[PDB]
Structure formats: C-alpha cells, structure tokens
C-alpha cells in the first residue's frame, strides 16, 4: 500500500525534474499486481546496476535512501508556514498584543 501510494505520487518524488502521465483513478490499488525486480541487461553492467548498499527492500526505502529528502523537508516546511500563516496562533498573538 505504501508502494502504490508512492506510485501515484511519483510526480512529487522527482521534484519537477521529471513529470508523469496524470493517471488519477479513485482507487490506486489495482486488482492484480506482482512485486518484482529488474534482473540484468547484459549490455550494461557498470552503471546500470544498483550496488549492494543500494538494493533495498521496498520502493519507499529506495526513495528515502535517495537524495533530496532535505528538498522534501524544505518544501514541506514552506507549505507548513503558508498554512499556519493566519489560522489560530496568529489570532492568539493578536489577542495577547491587545490585552497587553
């Protein structure tokens, strides 16, 4: 289920460097799936091959082991500031400045 949520959010994962076909059904889980692994292209084996410290178990573990997790955290904190912009801590501060 985490892997399927990641597959429907793979536009967000590559942060604008690579956009994807907007397939948005109501249920992201298909009826028939099978989690497999790329084996080997015999023509390319020096850089088209994940190493032992990068062959992880799930897809979300590969996304987290990749870079730009700080980029996700930066975008999340910008969204959090924009959504805490004027909601209720702002009004608590206004009420305290009036009462002082």
């Amino acid at each position: 289920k985490r892997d399927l949520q990641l597959l429907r959010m793979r536009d967000v994962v590559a942060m604008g460097k690579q956009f994807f076909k907007k397939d948005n059904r109501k249920d992201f889980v298909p009826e028939y799936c099978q989690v497999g692994t790329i084996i080997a292209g015999a023509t390319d084996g020096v850089s088209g091959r994940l190493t032992r410290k990068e062959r992880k178990r799930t897809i979300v573990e590969e996304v987290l082991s990749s870079d730009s997790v700080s980029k996700y955290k930066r975008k999340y904190h910008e969204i959090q500031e924009h959504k805490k912009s004027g909601r209720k801590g702002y009004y608590k501060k206004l009420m305290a400045a009036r009462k002082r």
Partner: protein, 49 residues
C-alpha cells in the same frame, strides 16, 4: 529655504508606505448553542464523538 536655513523636510513614519504582512484569515468553526443543538430533530441532530 530649507537648504539655506537648515531645517529637514517633515516626514512621518506612520505616513511612509510599508509592506503589510497579511496572515491567511482562518475563522473559527460554527459554535451551535446547547439548547438549539438539543432541540433540533433527529434527521438533523449533530453527531460529535
């Protein structure tokens, strides 16, 4: 006159334009009174866990 007899031009800091930081206005939810919320009928009764 001001440059000759050495008096600065009058400038009000409350009058000089500034940038205004507006937080996004979020309002409180609806606060239904207890007597009305206990008197209104079953199909429209408020369900709060």
């Amino acid at each position: 006159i001001r440059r000759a007899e050495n008096i600065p031009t009058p400038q009000n800091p409350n009058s000089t334009y500034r940038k205004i930081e507006r937080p996004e206005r979020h309002f409180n939810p609806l606060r239904v009174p207890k007597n009305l919320a206990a008197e209104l009928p079953f199909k429209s009764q408020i369900v709060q866990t």
